[PDB]
């Protein structure tokens, strides 16, 4: 198996524009949304058909109740941060929790929080402690670390429960998540050489340019891996042509254990 991950995000907004939710929570497996909840619908709902098809109504009903409680807790926590920062106006609070199952069978697990889109508190599940970025975070760190049992619970959740969930969802979604669609790759001139790939899945891909068999990463412009809209992805990389000396330029693409070379003549 390739590396896979499960992660859940929460977003709280303290003074949102009318109609815009004060709370949103979305789960992902790899790049795929799997679950959604917000303070307007007040319902947890599937975002992938292989989730809807495999989790009975009792699952969505129960986590809907938990998310209604998590919503309120997020509001209370954001209220507390904005009081201690002494901040007016609308501010954001975010959480990300998740785990990775790596190809070699090892695992990772992570939990962290942000205020106004900047790291705020970062959990270390091995030292069982919270890293605080400033003195408001430091006050919260002291309160959370006083509740040693919840740190132990979170380590267990990240290391055992999260991985179990991930393996369960990976089987549910296996026809989507474990497939391979190889890239279609082409080179053109625009004066720079553009190497362009499309139609590939999974999104992880490495494209680069070599000159005379050597890679100078400082001379390459790397385009982003972008969704095409149909479940597949596209990407590109470019290099500038030296008009004073001839060079052998070649585009190299690695995707899902296959390497491709396109030599420019």
């Amino acid at each position: 198996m390739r590396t896979h991950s499960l992660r859940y995000f929460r977003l709280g907004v303290s003074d949102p524009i009318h109609g815009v939710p004060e709370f949103i929570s979305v789960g992902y497996v790899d790049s795929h949304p799997i679950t959604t909840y917000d303070s307007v619908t007040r319902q947890k709902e599937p975002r992938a058909p292989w989730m809807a098809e495999n989790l009975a109504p009792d699952h969505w009903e129960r986590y809907t109740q938990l998310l209604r409680g998590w919503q309120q807790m997020f509001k209370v926590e954001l209220k507390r941060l904005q009081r201690h920062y002494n901040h007016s106006g609308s501010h954001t609070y975010q959480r990300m929790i998740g785990c990775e199952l790596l190809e070699d069978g090892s695992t990772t697990g992570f939990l962290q929080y942000a205020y106004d889109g900047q790291d705020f508190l970062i959990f270390n599940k091995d030292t069982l402690s919270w890293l605080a970025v400033d003195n408001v975070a430091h006050t919260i760190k002291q309160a959370w670390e006083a509740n040693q049992h919840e740190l132990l619970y979170q380590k267990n959740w990240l290391e055992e429960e999260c991985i179990a969930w991930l393996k369960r969802f990976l089987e549910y979604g296996k026809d989507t998540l474990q497939r391979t669609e190889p890239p279609l790759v082409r080179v053109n001139r625009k004066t720079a050489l553009f190497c362009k790939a499309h139609g590939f899945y999974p999104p992880e891909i490495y494209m680069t340019w070599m000159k005379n068999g050597e890679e100078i990463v400082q001379e390459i412009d790397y385009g982003d891996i972008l969704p095409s809209g149909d479940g597949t992805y596209q990407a590109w990389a470019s290099i500038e042509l030296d008009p004073q000396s001839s060079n052998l330029y070649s585009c190299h693409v690695e995707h899902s254990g296959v390497h491709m070379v396109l030599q420019v003549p």
Partner: antibody
Amino acid sequence: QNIDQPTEMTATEGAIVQINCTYQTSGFNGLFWYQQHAGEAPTFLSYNVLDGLEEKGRFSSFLSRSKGYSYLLLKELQMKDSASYLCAVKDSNYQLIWGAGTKLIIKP
Amino acid sequence: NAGVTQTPKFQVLKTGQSMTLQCAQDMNHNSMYWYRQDPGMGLRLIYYSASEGTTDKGEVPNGYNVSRLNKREFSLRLESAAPSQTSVYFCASSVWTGEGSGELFFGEGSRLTVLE
């Protein structure tokens, strides 16, 4: 999903007693012990979620996740320890599954 | 600092009679629960309220309803008592739910006997 603990145990004042709890659940988010004196409300004793032994006065609580097993260990038994002891496990959906309780009888 | 206060302590009912049990907590807790306790089995959840403004069924909701009246109070209703509802009922609360380690705080219990 089930939780199993003995119905009743009898031990002597001053001695030690180990109350066992085994569980088979869909996922695991921790194991609780509660004390309930006859005619009274349950009260929280302990929580375990990682492996090993935690001590709290005369009481200790042990957990083995791989064996799906916990014990509540009471040392230097006193008559006031006469009570029921309830084990409960939180599953993957944070639902608490309760054991039927172990009634502890102490011989003076 | 009273903790969880539930009433009544004891009640006799005839089959078909209505009854409401009251529960209040003064701990500023968010989550509240109604359990029944019967001989030979573990506590069974009837209904719960994960937060103010929401409630849902537990494992044995039939014959019961609840009202989370405000953050403090969570009442349990037997609209038409049946003899099978003879039991000991416990209200409980916790700071939050959907977290591993947080314990329950229990009320004193309400003993109901429903008779034909």
